[PDB]
Amino acid sequence: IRDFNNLTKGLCTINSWHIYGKDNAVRIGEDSDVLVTREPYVSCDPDECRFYALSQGTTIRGKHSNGTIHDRSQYRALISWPLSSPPTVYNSRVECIGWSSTSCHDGKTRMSICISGPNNNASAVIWYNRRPVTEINTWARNILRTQESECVCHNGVCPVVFTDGSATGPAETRIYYFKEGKILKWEPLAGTAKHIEECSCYGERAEITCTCRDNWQGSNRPVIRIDPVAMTHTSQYICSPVLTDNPRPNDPTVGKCNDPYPGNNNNGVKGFSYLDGVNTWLGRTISIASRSGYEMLKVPNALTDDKSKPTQGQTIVLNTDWSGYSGSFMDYWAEGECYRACFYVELIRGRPKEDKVWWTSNSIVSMCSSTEFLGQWDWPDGAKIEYFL
Amino acid sequence: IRDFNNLTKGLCTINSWHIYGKDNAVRIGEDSDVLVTREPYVSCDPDECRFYALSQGTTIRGKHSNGTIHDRSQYRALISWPLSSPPTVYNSRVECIGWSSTSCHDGKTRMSICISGPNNNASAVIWYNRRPVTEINTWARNILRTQESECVCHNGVCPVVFTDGSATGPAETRIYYFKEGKILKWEPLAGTAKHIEECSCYGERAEITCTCRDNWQGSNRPVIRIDPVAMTHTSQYICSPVLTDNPRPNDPTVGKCNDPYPGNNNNGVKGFSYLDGVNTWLGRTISIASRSGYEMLKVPNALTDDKSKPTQGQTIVLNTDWSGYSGSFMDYWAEGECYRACFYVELIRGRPKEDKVWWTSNSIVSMCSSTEFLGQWDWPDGAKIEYFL
Amino acid sequence: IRDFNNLTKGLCTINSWHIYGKDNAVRIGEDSDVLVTREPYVSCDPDECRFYALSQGTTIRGKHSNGTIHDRSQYRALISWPLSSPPTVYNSRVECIGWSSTSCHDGKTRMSICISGPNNNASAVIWYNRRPVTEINTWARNILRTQESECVCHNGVCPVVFTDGSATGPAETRIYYFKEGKILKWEPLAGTAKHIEECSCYGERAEITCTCRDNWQGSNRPVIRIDPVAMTHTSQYICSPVLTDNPRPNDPTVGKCNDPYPGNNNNGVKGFSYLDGVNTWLGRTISIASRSGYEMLKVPNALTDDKSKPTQGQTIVLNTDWSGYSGSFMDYWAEGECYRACFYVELIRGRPKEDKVWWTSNSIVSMCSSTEFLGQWDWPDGAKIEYFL
Amino acid sequence: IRDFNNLTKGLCTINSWHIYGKDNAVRIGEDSDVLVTREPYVSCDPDECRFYALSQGTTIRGKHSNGTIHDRSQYRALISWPLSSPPTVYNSRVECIGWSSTSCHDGKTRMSICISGPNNNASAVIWYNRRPVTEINTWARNILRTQESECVCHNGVCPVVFTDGSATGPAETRIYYFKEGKILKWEPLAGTAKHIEECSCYGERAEITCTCRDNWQGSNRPVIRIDPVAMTHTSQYICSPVLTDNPRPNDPTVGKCNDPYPGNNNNGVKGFSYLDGVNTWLGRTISIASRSGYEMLKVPNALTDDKSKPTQGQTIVLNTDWSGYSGSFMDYWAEGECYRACFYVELIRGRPKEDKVWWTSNSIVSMCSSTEFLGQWDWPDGAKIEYFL
Ligand SMILES: *[C@@H]1O[C@H](CO)[C@@H](O[C@@H]2O[C@H](CO)[C@@H](O[C@@H]3O[C@H](CO[C@H]4O[C@H](CO[C@H]5O[C@H](CO)[C@@H](O)[C@H](O)[C@@H]5O)[C@@H](O)[C@H](O[C@H]5O[C@H](CO)[C@@H](O)[C@H](O)[C@@H]5O)[C@@H]4O)[C@@H](O)[C@H](O[C@H]4O[C@H](CO)[C@@H](O)[C@H](O)[C@@H]4O[C@H]4O[C@H](CO)[C@@H](O)[C@H](O)[C@@H]4O[C@H]4O[C@H](CO)[C@@H](O)[C@H](O)[C@@H]4O)[C@@H]3O)[C@H](O)[C@H]2NC(C)=O)[C@H](O)[C@H]1NC(C)=O
Ligand SMILES: *[C@@H]1O[C@H](CO)[C@@H](O[C@@H]2O[C@H](CO)[C@@H](O[C@@H]3O[C@H](CO[C@H]4O[C@H](CO[C@H]5O[C@H](CO)[C@@H](O)[C@H](O)[C@@H]5O)[C@@H](O)[C@H](O[C@H]5O[C@H](CO)[C@@H](O)[C@H](O)[C@@H]5O)[C@@H]4O)[C@@H](O)[C@H](O[C@H]4O[C@H](CO)[C@@H](O)[C@H](O)[C@@H]4O[C@H]4O[C@H](CO)[C@@H](O)[C@H](O)[C@@H]4O[C@H]4O[C@H](CO)[C@@H](O)[C@H](O)[C@@H]4O)[C@@H]3O)[C@H](O)[C@H]2NC(C)=O)[C@H](O)[C@H]1NC(C)=O
Ligand SMILES: *[C@@H]1O[C@H](CO)[C@@H](O[C@@H]2O[C@H](CO)[C@@H](O[C@@H]3O[C@H](CO[C@H]4O[C@H](CO[C@H]5O[C@H](CO)[C@@H](O)[C@H](O)[C@@H]5O)[C@@H](O)[C@H](O[C@H]5O[C@H](CO)[C@@H](O)[C@H](O)[C@@H]5O)[C@@H]4O)[C@@H](O)[C@H](O[C@H]4O[C@H](CO)[C@@H](O)[C@H](O)[C@@H]4O[C@H]4O[C@H](CO)[C@@H](O)[C@H](O)[C@@H]4O[C@H]4O[C@H](CO)[C@@H](O)[C@H](O)[C@@H]4O)[C@@H]3O)[C@H](O)[C@H]2NC(C)=O)[C@H](O)[C@H]1NC(C)=O
Ligand SMILES: *[C@@H]1O[C@H](CO)[C@@H](O[C@@H]2O[C@H](CO)[C@@H](O[C@@H]3O[C@H](CO[C@H]4O[C@H](CO[C@H]5O[C@H](CO)[C@@H](O)[C@H](O)[C@@H]5O)[C@@H](O)[C@H](O[C@H]5O[C@H](CO)[C@@H](O)[C@H](O)[C@@H]5O)[C@@H]4O)[C@@H](O)[C@H](O[C@H]4O[C@H](CO)[C@@H](O)[C@H](O)[C@@H]4O[C@H]4O[C@H](CO)[C@@H](O)[C@H](O)[C@@H]4O[C@H]4O[C@H](CO)[C@@H](O)[C@H](O)[C@@H]4O)[C@@H]3O)[C@H](O)[C@H]2NC(C)=O)[C@H](O)[C@H]1NC(C)=O
Ligand SMILES: OC[C@H]1O[C@@H](O)[C@H](O)[C@@H](O)[C@@H]1O
Ligand SMILES: OC[C@H]1O[C@@H](O)[C@H](O)[C@@H](O)[C@@H]1O
Ligand SMILES: OC[C@H]1O[C@H](O)[C@H](O)[C@@H](O)[C@@H]1O
Ligand SMILES: OC[C@H]1O[C@H](O)[C@H](O)[C@@H](O)[C@@H]1O
Ligand SMILES: OC[C@H]1O[C@H](O)[C@H](O)[C@@H](O)[C@@H]1O
Ligand SMILES: OC[C@H]1O[C@H](O)[C@H](O)[C@@H](O)[C@@H]1O
């Protein structure tokens, strides 16, 4: 009775952002059985949207929260839970086991991907309709890894971006095209992006756009544009001088379209953009040095205009509060003639910036676009670290 | 397969009130993971009735409960949970994010509205079928705010009363008429009510009646009567000398139909009435000074008779116990030829009246009408504050 | 699509009892959020059987557990929860509010009844399909009260036995016949039973048999047999000298069919029997003085034979362990040509017998009949009281 | 609308194993309400796979966890819970009561079997569609007991292996053939296996293969092959010199097909194999002395070749970590032309090996086969015992 979803609509006009979800997980977890997480995201099914993240297999107050600054262990899993509830022991659904993930619904059912293993011997398991269907072994033997936010599907084809290799030099990025959890095709990265991590993707009018993290040399963000019908892609960087990785140098007046904008090496943060002509909005941390603050900037033609500057903006998280990863999603099953852009921001608490506790976790805030020009508030995690001492 | 509900029935004859629900949330939350709340209510779908409230994004025993006397923060959300269970971390569904709300089912699906933001820049998000559909920016830049109990729908049209502006002088009240979460029309307040807050509404025979709080000058309650087909309304005050706001002066022998009954300024409490000729019942606190006690009084023709006094009553909460906000709802999908009036009372515990704890929360008690003349009990919150010290 | 259930089958031959359910609630609640309860029972829907009990509106470890020896408060409610799970804050469904209850499914949906109020002004609320439908005021102004185990329905007619009046003298017992939560008829108690409390009922071949507690004078149990088609009944006592109330005198060699067997006044315990000719089994405590131990005895023709003695038995709970109330239920929707008799035993822990704790609660054990002659085990609550100190 | 499942497919080619599930129960239970368990397994329905285990009727942190090294009590039950979640008080479903179990879905609904009682008087209760249908009394009066992992069905016939009698000498093993919870037939053990415990079974091409534990004399594993259409079986031992019980002597160069391989008496561990010609994989502990480590070895023709040695392998749990019972299951309702072999390993923590705590419990790890040659990781329980002190 269900058909595959097709990306038949364009983006709605984004004139501001409204609050969509917030879980207050760290506040609540100070005195309830909330799992330690990081790398969260949001993804919709045709009848529900849910929060997702990588659990660390312990509660925050639990003694096993000590050491959760670490990224890869056998105790991590992709979990999902109801929108704006916290990720608790009792309400979280485990989608698959591992320390890197993506997930998306194709209109009929959901594909989830988790990678696990030691650094030199990791493998992806691709689940479809809550069953494992395909496995992929590491090709470069160096932390096979993927998006950490939702993938996007079109007529059953769900492309996913993976990287295997160094985070501080050339690596081997591949785009896999899945259908019903099976590999139709894969391609090596093409175009002018020089390094790819942690792609944040969205779809509109039969094209999928991903904004990624050049961890090696670039403080501008690489962009991959995927045609899920032809199963081909292109890549470049956001041309705009409004630089959106972190850490980063100060904004110049002219950016770079086909190479990394230099100044900071071997670091970054997962982030996102919506690239739609004049209707283009970029997210970034406010700090150029650290994962603090978060703002959206309207930067008309950021993708293609190497001198484009902001014409409007919205503060999401004050620079006096911690942010983190951010990513895109949309409710492809909503009513109306256009898709409304959404995003989330991971609000990281604990280590390394707050080292009086022994753990690292996060909460989530999420916003979607409005055609109104709405007033802005800031949305901090809200927990008091001293309470955990 | 579902059609919009129509208000085709009149009210059942109210001869007494029977216990409908009670969650004992503060008792239970002394040793379980119960969220701090305030501004609760009850609302029915065609196949379930649920408790609703504004969470404070912390448990009661949690250290973040300190400071929850405050009304507006980024950590509040409209939550719902099963009838007479407590609002726990693990059983509460987040409907939307914000610090002021309303919600109602139209027979097909549910509309929920949450307002958030700083005082001078708040916005409403109107959700329908669990998706955001419309947003409304503040028009007076002073705590845009709404009912804090359920709205009512008729043939898909669900009117909602909002206020923006001062709580201690003239403000800008609007009635919005929504259908499928979209704005059909709005109107500014008309009639003789001089200030409107926190409307408590019910529907019968194609009319919606709301009893509100005149926070500015009136200790009688303003009333708005809305025709959801014509999308028009009128307003006045309850004429009766049985005054039902709090705090209030002592009852006179003659009330006021078209102006605030004076004596107390710049305060009030959310409350409700059922105004149905001889079948008219008013709720109020027992104390004229504080939110303590709660009683129902049968006051025939209270709406229109400026000398009407009680002919029957029922004590709901003794004056030696704390009460709080109260509001109306009905199960529009019940069997029978008439709609049975129901209400809830918020039983506030903690600050400011019980200041040995650092938190403010509440539990809920709820009653519905009977055509029998039933014996009465009183229904306290039941928690011992000393246990929380 | 569902029709009312009819009692078309006879009882299966009972040759022994097998374990059906057990919740270990007190053990588990020593370190999890388990509600304090008493007066439990079991009742089936067409697609699920559940545990039921009167909550006390606090967890066991909670400070509000102090005082829960008391029977009637505003903090009690009928709750249900999944078979053999414990009654927790997070998995318990509130069916109605009050301190006395019954509940049964008619094949289409469930009727639940809760009574609340002060001793001289109590009222029953009859819920059907999870909505209140009928209310009944106290008729004798002295703790209106009902079965504390499931009722039984036949072609939509669900009789329920109520008592109002003294527990230590003549009282006013009524049988109400409900359909879809509405009163079709009621009758005063007739026959030779002189006092009725806490009836435990089952149905077979279009008749409902209830075994009750004569709290006033009788240590034999009164029996009410109800024809739910004619809506009439009879009553007498179990004739057998195998006395089954508690406390009680020692067993004589000849019982009494039409009067209380004397020796103990003004006390008792809820209990049950299956009265089916040679296929007759009685439950009782092992102790004649206290609620300790529990055994089933096959006593052919106990109902009608005033010299009938046991021919077989099964120990359920050793006399060195606490028991409590017990009652009957069956899964009227099971497969097969006959109905299998089941029962539960309430295993009371805490006050008054274990007074080093300040609370009273219980767990549940439940058995059903087998046509095999199965080996027996004993089934204690299993908690160590010292752990709660 | 559902038909009985038939075993129409063969096994997929097993070239390695991928992570399927892991619950981290002991880590998480250090600070959440996780039930103490042992003897876990996994079993699929047509629309969900779940974890199963025998609860001990207490949480790990609870004071009643003291003494849970013991195997048989009245506080045990078969529980199930969602895949890779932990077995918590609030998310666990009780399937039946007892201290030995099996369970399987026949394509229409699920059969579950639990045994309880004292050692000399135990009985099995066979539940079907969540109702008790058949009971079986002990035949040898010495701990009637069964598989502790899933059974397998074919056209409605679900064979189950039981043992009653000594664990240290000849015993009375029976194969029962159930359909809709009713006994069609049973047979005594035939063939050359000399003692049978704790069979781990799987089905393919209309045959069911079970690998068991010879607790008496054998360090090779007995195998029972059952034809569920003819309702007949055969038995022998795995011929291979790759010995897979524990404890065990060192591997010889030639095994035994029709007798126990000697060297260790009166002990063992539940384990499993997939016996499919060249596509044969055996699981075993790494240690020959204790339940530590776990590895899979590809041993072509292990069943029939008494000199067969490994040609490939995969380490699942390092020898420096505790393992435990292991068993087979498959998702018979997955897509594709073949059934993918899966297994679980019980990771036992606490007593007797870690005796600074007073409890014994476990977590679960589970893997399924891949046709890829995937890299390997090890999968420890992950809890730090010192945290529980
Ligand atoms: C209630 O809520 C509402 C709604 O949210 C609030 O209103 C919002 O207020 C915020 C804050 O002011 C606004 O965001 C800022 O928007 C401006 C862009 O708008 C300005 O510029 C526009 C473009 O002008 C240029 O081009 C036009 C033609 O296209 C031309 O006409 C003009 O002459 C000029 O050449 C103007 O069009 C626009 O005017 C319009 O709107 C006005 C209202 O804002 C109105 O008054 C006008 O009439 C007209 O209608 C307006 O002038 C962004 O520039 C700004 O972002 C910069 O600054 C913030 C800090 O404030 C910074 O964090 C951003 O990153 C960014 O600045 C950095 O990057 C730049 C780009 O590289 C760089 O140049 C800067 O130096 C700076 O760089 C440094 O910091 C970064 C980050 O740390 C670092 O990486 C660098 O290295 C470096 O160190 C904000 O986004 C909203 O747009 C506004 N919304 C609406 C709908 O009005 C309202 O205030 C609330 N009310 C109350 C009472 O609180
Ligand atoms: C078992 O349960 C049952 C059921 O619940 C219990 O029975 C209930 O008992 C309660 C408590 O007594 C009753 O509530 C009160 O009801 C009266 C109204 O009924 C009286 O008056 C009626 C009207 O009489 C006038 O008009 C009629 C014609 O219409 C005329 O005939 C008559 O002469 C007179 O002119 C009478 O009809 C009625 O009689 C009927 O019922 C009697 C039983 O009650 C029965 O005996 C008769 O035969 C007949 O059938 C009866 O006399 C309310 O007036 C009263 O409310 C006032 O008082 C309470 C405190 O008790 C107060 O809190 C209320 O706010 C209110 O008083 C305040 O406001 C007034 C209005 O402005 C003001 O005038 C007062 O001075 C007072 O004001 C002060 O306090 C307020 C609040 O703090 C403050 O704001 C002000 O500023 C100021 O300081 C109660 O609601 C139930 O009706 C009754 N139910 C039933 C079905 O019987 C039963 O008791 C329980 N059993 C046991 C053993 O416990
Ligand atoms: C493995 O599990 C199995 C299955 O559970 C275990 O087997 C079960 O074992 C138990 C315990 O022994 C049995 O329960 C008892 O059953 C007897 C009834 O059976 C006896 O009597 C039958 C009737 O005999 C009379 O009539 C027949 C004709 O109808 C006639 O032939 C005969 O001559 C005589 O006239 C016999 O038919 C029956 O024999 C059959 O079964 C035998 C096996 O049991 C077998 O050996 C035979 O071959 C034959 O097949 C048998 O002799 C009940 O009487 C007994 O209940 C009384 O005693 C218990 C305490 O043990 C007490 O708590 C009960 O309340 C009751 O006694 C009180 O009440 C009486 C009635 O008023 C009174 O007379 C007593 O004085 C006593 O009263 C005192 O205490 C009470 C309570 O505290 C107090 O209120 C009073 O005031 C007073 O102070 C038991 O129910 C099971 O039936 C049996 N099941 C099966 C299937 O075999 C097996 O043991 C386990 N294995 C192991 C190794 O553990
Ligand atoms: C990334 O991940 C990948 C994938 O997991 C990792 O690659 C895996 O690496 C592991 C570990 O090395 C491998 O497992 C071992 O496999 C060998 C079997 O393969 C060897 O032997 C094969 C058979 O050879 C014989 O026959 C062939 C013809 O059939 C003939 O040609 C040959 O001459 C010989 O006669 C070879 O075919 C095979 O070669 C192939 O693969 C090689 C890669 O492995 C490749 O290099 C070749 O080119 C070729 O393609 C290979 O040589 C198992 O033997 C071994 O299991 C034994 O040893 C482990 C300990 O390491 C032990 O725990 C096992 O129990 C077992 O040894 C015990 O039992 C034996 C049987 O009775 C006994 O003989 C031993 O003495 C020993 O007994 C003692 O211990 C036990 C247990 O404690 C005790 O009970 C006894 O009493 C006694 O005390 C392993 O299973 C994987 O197969 C391999 N997978 C793949 C796909 O490559 C990779 O390493 C990872 N990368 C990194 C960087 O980490
Ligand atoms: O009816 C008057 C009062 O009587 C008391 O016994 C009840 O407990 C109160 O709740 C009631 O208000
Ligand atoms: O492959 C051999 C070993 O390599 C290690 O790096 C992995 O962590 C182990 O799990 C593995 O068994
Ligand atoms: O060594 C790092 C590991 O320490 C503990 O196991 C932590 O619980 C785990 O999250 C972390 O990966
Ligand atoms: O400053 C007031 C705030 O303090 C803390 O954050 C409380 O948890 C929050 O409820 C409150 O709004
Ligand atoms: O006074 C007796 C009452 O004390 C406390 O409220 C107990 O929590 C309650 O159960 C009991 O009814
Ligand atoms: O005596 C052993 C028993 O002790 C306690 O009851 C434990 O909680 C239980 O698991 C165990 O069987």
Numbering used by the authors:
A (entry chain A), B (entry chain A), C (entry chain A), D (entry chain A): 81 to 169, 169A, 170 to 333, 335 to 392, 394 to 412, 412A, 412B, 413 to 468
Task: List sentences quoted exactly from the publication behind this structure.
Influenza A viruses display two membrane-anchored glycoproteins, hemagglutinin (HA) and neuraminidase (NA). After virus replication, NA removes sialic acid residues from viral and cellular glycoproteins to facilitate virus release and allow spread of infection to new cells. NA is a good target for structure-based enzyme inhibitor design because its well-characterized active site is conserved across all influenza A and B viruses. The 11 amino acids in the active site that interact with sialic acid remain unchanged amidst extensive genetic variation in the rest of the sequence; for an alignment, see.
We have determined the crystal structure of 2 in complex with a type A N9 NA to a resolution of 1.55 Å, and we discuss it in terms of the successful reorientation of the benzene ring and the lack of improvement in binding affinity. Inhibitor 2 uses benzoic acid to mimic the pyranose ring, a bis-(hydroxymethyl)-substituted 2-pyrrolidinone ring in place of the N-acetyl group of the sialic acid, and a branched aliphatic structure to fill the sialic acid C6 subsite. Structural studies of complexes between several benzoic acid leads and type B NA showed that these inhibitors were bound in the active site in a similar fashion to sialic acid, and the same is observed in the new structure. The carboxylate group of the inhibitor interacts with the guanidinium groups of arginine residues at positions 118, 292, and 371 as seen in all NA substrate and inhibitor complexes and calculated to be energetically important. The pyrrolidine ring interacts with Arg152 by forming a hydrogen bond with its carbonyl oxygen (O15). The one well-ordered propyl chain is anchored by hydrophobic contacts with Ile222, Ala246, and Arg224. The other propyl chain that is disordered is exposed to the solvent and therefore not contributing to binding energy because the one interaction seen is of low occupancy and at the upper limit of the distances considered as significant. The benzene ring of 2 is tilted by 8.9° relative to compound 1, increasing the number of contacts as was predicted in the design. However, one branch of the 3-heptyl group makes no significant contacts due to multiple conformations, which may be why the IC50 is no better than the previous compounds. Most glycans are flexible and only the first few sugars are seen, but the glycan attached to Asn200 is well resolved due to interaction with the adjacent subunit and is seen to contain GlcNAc2Man7.
